[PDB]
Structure 1
Amino acid sequence: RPTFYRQELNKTIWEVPERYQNLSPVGSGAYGSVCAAFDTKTGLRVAVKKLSRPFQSIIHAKRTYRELRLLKHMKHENVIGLLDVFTPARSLEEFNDVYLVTHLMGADLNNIVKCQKLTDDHVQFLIYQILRGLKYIHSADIIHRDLKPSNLAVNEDCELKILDFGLARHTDDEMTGYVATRWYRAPEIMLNWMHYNQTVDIWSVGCIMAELLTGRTLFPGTDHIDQLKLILRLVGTPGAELLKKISSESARNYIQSLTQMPKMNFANVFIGANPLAVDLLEKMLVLDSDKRITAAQALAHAYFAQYHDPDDEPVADPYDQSFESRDLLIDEWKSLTYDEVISFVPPP
């Protein structure tokens, strides 16, 4: 057990092993806060997330267990991995705080798409890495659900990691209006159409790819309805085959009220794009989620010929998500979490 030292940072008490030096706040939110620090043991610049009251409710306790499980499992070049996890607590009785340590990310993909001039080769490499990371996440039946530029860490070498930097609740207010929180969402998830699957993430990748190509938000709707309209205008209104799959009668009924519209010519939307980019976009941005290209399928697409390597695009180890269907008490979620903290083994 290392020695821990205390330090207040924005009215938060931080109690961290001594190996973590020079803590500087980089983000705050209802679910936690993050600091940059220097890890004297590895020489790495790190991010350290302190979870805010991780066991105050059942939903909180399960969310803390969930993140930990996720993070302990992710071992891929293009996905955030866990360097360390710690608590000041000496026992389960003491246990009330959880800190997570990952590699520090300077820039997100936002601090790239704005002003920084992107070649088609850069778009190729960036999206390739997103897809390579997604293949791995989806192989474990893990769905990101919230892919967007701010959830993608990118270094000076254009190397990329998927993460989820959400410190916030994800409320109705947060999904409302002219907001980037909603711009990358698959329609079926944005509007609660049906039970969704992992292709929600492919929709997001399409929105991201478009924006990288044009330097502009693909669907910057001023609200849910306006956004739907932006979408339908590009990809066309649904036919009867798709309407059947909208299991929400009220959703179905509204979407039938709309003037029918054909799918547009993408060559005329993405003027001057590599035709292979255009092609790939048309296969990502399909209304019917059963017919979207998958991550595995898209890696083999001609657009990525320069990067694609089937012997170096690995799948995940099996991920037991049976806890998700389980009904536990706070104390039980907490002991589960405690066990996972105790048993962490750092990477090589």
Structure 2
Amino acid sequence: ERPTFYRQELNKTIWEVPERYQNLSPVGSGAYGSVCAAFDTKTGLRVAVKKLSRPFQSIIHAKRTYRELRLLKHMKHENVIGLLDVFTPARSLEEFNDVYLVTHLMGADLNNIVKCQKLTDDHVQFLIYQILRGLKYIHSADIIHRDLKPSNLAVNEDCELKILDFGLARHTDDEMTGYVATRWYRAPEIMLNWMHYNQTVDIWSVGCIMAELLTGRTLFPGTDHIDQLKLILRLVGTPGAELLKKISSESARNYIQSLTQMPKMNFANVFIGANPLAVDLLEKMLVLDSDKRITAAQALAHAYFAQYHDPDDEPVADPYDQSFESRDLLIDEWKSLTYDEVISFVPPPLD
């Protein structure tokens, strides 16, 4: 049953993959992984193959490897990345040291859609509807994306959208410093660590994306974390009594009350010419208090998407057991858990 593997050096990386994968070519890499494009001769699909970099070098890395595979094996939704294959060249656990993941090849993301074409209200309707439909699914499994930005959304020529995560390196202080797309879509409560965050972090990110599809421009292109907070508060208004109380960071909470109070602005006078229903939806997404933000499920029932809403084709996820996240284990334990998931993978219906 075990395929035959062949070797190849590509940018100083030894790729050992099954013979089904041909025409391997580097797309990109980082600390957590290397990615190639290839052609899958079994399914006939252009695919991305990610080779994980030192997946078991520490506890943190091992747990991270296990986490991603558990996530990917669970996600089965039209608007969310599907796992086509996972494999390792190793014939046993003793020699299990490499993991490769395969999915459908992107190419075009929402970033290049927004820069290099005219988007109509009906295109915006369709693209945000598909982000929220994917999001209803993943939130239903208590999965939080936390890094939704236009580079993590794949968009094909028919305007069909998938949510993925193309993060190949760590989410460090330096990667979030300055004038960077890395921070522009983050809910303020996670950007400044105000509190224990909830899944409505992702809804904040949708609002910033929806706004950018409407105007063609970044909503909050802060030059640093504080400049970004100023851009945000200028639009949505400074916190009132109720929200401040909920900010457990005494340090965060005292910086806020130094700011001069500002009202929420008129969104119709920022988003000029836009569908009044878009503006309405945006006002419900872009709300400082995460408790009061619209959820994906609620947002799908909004008038703005009447053209597309179908309550019988907006599925929820099967229960997802995340108890491992509380679990403390050894590198070797995380590794064998990971091995069991590799060996147990069943590919999706062909094709």
Distance in 2 (CA, whole Å) between partners of 1:276 and 1:26 is 39
Deviations 1:230-261 (A, max 9, x none): 00000000001000000000000000100000
Distance in 2 (CA, whole Å) between partners of 1:259 and 1:60 is 44
Distance in 1 (CA, whole Å) between partners of 2:211 and 2:60 is 35
Deviation at 1:282, TM superposition (A): 0.3
Deviation at 1:102, TM superposition (A): 0.3
2:226 corresponds to: 225
Unaligned runs of 5+ in 1: none
TM-score computed with the length of structure 1 as normaliser: 1.00
Write the mapping of 1:170-185 to structure 2, written as runs, cut at 5 A.
170-185=171-186
Deviation at 1:45, TM superposition (A): 0.3
2:33 corresponds to: 32
Aligned length, in residue pairs: 348
Deviation at 1:115, TM superposition (A): 3.1
Distance in 2 (CA, whole Å) between partners of 1:245 and 1:21 is 54
Deviation at 1:330, TM superposition (A): 0.2
Deviations 1:129-175 (A, max 9, x none): 00000000000000000000000000000000000000011110000
The reply to whether residue 86 of structure 1 matches residue 74 of structure 2 is: no
Deviation at 1:7, TM superposition (A): 0.3
Distance in 2 (CA, whole Å) between partners of 1:8 and 1:210 is 43
Distance in 2 (CA, whole Å) between partners of 1:27 and 1:155 is 20
Distance in 1 (CA, whole Å) between partners of 2:12 and 2:275 is 51
Distance in 2 (CA, whole Å) between partners of 1:298 and 1:40 is 40
Distance in 2 (CA, whole Å) between partners of 1:59 and 1:197 is 23
Distance in 2 (CA, whole Å) between partners of 1:276 and 1:106 is 32
SS of alignment partner, residue 47 of structure 1: strand
Deviations 1:310-345 (A, max 9, x none): 000000000000000000000000000000000000
- Kindly report structure 1 stretches of 4+ aligned residues shifted beyond 2 Å: none
1:97 corresponds to: 98
SS of alignment partner, residue 107 of structure 1: coil
Distance in 2 (CA, whole Å) between partners of 1:115 and 1:2 is 42
SS of alignment partner, residue 14 of structure 1: strand
1:280 corresponds to: 281
Deviations 1:258-287 (A, max 9, x none): 000000000000000000000000000000
Distance in 1 (CA, whole Å) between partners of 2:24 and 2:318 is 34
Distance in 1 (CA, whole Å) between partners of 2:74 and 2:59 is 22
Deviation at 1:68, TM superposition (A): 0.3
Distance in 1 (CA, whole Å) between partners of 2:6 and 2:97 is 16
Distance in 2 (CA, whole Å) between partners of 1:37 and 1:115 is 26
Deviations 1:86-110 (A, max 9, x none): 0000000010000000001120000
Distance in 1 (CA, whole Å) between partners of 2:347 and 2:175 is 36
Deviation at 1:31, TM superposition (A): 0.3
Deviation at 1:27, TM superposition (A): 1.2
Distance in 1 (CA, whole Å) between partners of 2:132 and 2:340 is 33
Distance in 1 (CA, whole Å) between partners of 2:281 and 2:169 is 33
- The root-mean-square deviation of aligned C-alpha atoms, in Å, is 0.4
2:132 corresponds to: 131
SS of alignment partner, residue 277 of structure 2: helix
Distance in 1 (CA, whole Å) between partners of 2:133 and 2:216 is 23
Distance in 1 (CA, whole Å) between partners of 2:282 and 2:336 is 45
Distance in 2 (CA, whole Å) between partners of 1:164 and 1:59 is 19
1:308 corresponds to: 309
Distance in 1 (CA, whole Å) between partners of 2:281 and 2:300 is 10
Distance in 1 (CA, whole Å) between partners of 2:40 and 2:91 is 22
SS of alignment partner, residue 311 of structure 1: helix
Deviations 1:212-237 (A, max 9, x none): 00000000000000000000000000
Distance in 2 (CA, whole Å) between partners of 1:64 and 1:285 is 33
1:342 corresponds to: 343
Distance in 1 (CA, whole Å) between partners of 2:186 and 2:202 is 8
Distance in 2 (CA, whole Å) between partners of 1:259 and 1:115 is 39
Distance in 2 (CA, whole Å) between partners of 1:255 and 1:341 is 48
1:194 corresponds to: 195
Deviation at 1:207, TM superposition (A): 0.3
Deviation at 1:82, TM superposition (A): 0.4
Distance in 1 (CA, whole Å) between partners of 2:248 and 2:13 is 45
Identity of aligned residues (%): 100
Distance in 2 (CA, whole Å) between partners of 1:81 and 1:246 is 37
Distance in 1 (CA, whole Å) between partners of 2:256 and 2:12 is 48
SS of alignment partner, residue 94 of structure 1: coil
1:152 corresponds to: 153
Distance in 2 (CA, whole Å) between partners of 1:44 and 1:182 is 34
- Tell which deviates more after alignment, 83-92 or 106-115: 106-115
Distance in 2 (CA, whole Å) between partners of 1:26 and 1:304 is 35
